[PDB]
């Protein structure tokens, strides 16, 4: 699993803007989504991403695992992720 090779990232402070060069679609991510995206850029696997989120936010692990699962799936549906 990895970020698609056709995607370019724009970092504006806390948030991230994504552009897909093939589909020509662009996206914005909120604070938590961008944190996850940064970890994906660093090549972190989901388990490591879950660890990072739980260490920085006041939240139970099952909630994080469930939300991450939904989030990655949403990314993949927009072809922002591949091999997921």
């Amino acid at each position: 699993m990895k970020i698609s090779d056709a995607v370019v990232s724009a970092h504006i402070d806390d948030e991230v803007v994504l552009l897909h060069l093939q589909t020509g679609t662009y996206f914005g991510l909120d604070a938590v989504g961008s944190r996850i995206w940064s970890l994906l850029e660093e090549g972190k696997r989901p388990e490591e991403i879950v660890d990072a989120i739980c260490a920085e936010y006041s939240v139970d692990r099952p909630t994080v695992e469930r939300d991450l699962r939904d989030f990655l799936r949403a990314l993949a549906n927009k072809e922002l992720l591949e091999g997921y």
Binding site: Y26, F27, D30, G33, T63, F71
Partner: peptide, 16 residues
Amino acid sequence: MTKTYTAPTLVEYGGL
């Protein structure tokens, strides 16, 4: 280590 959590969101804002 104690930030307020909200579920990650992907928002599509447009296209070429």
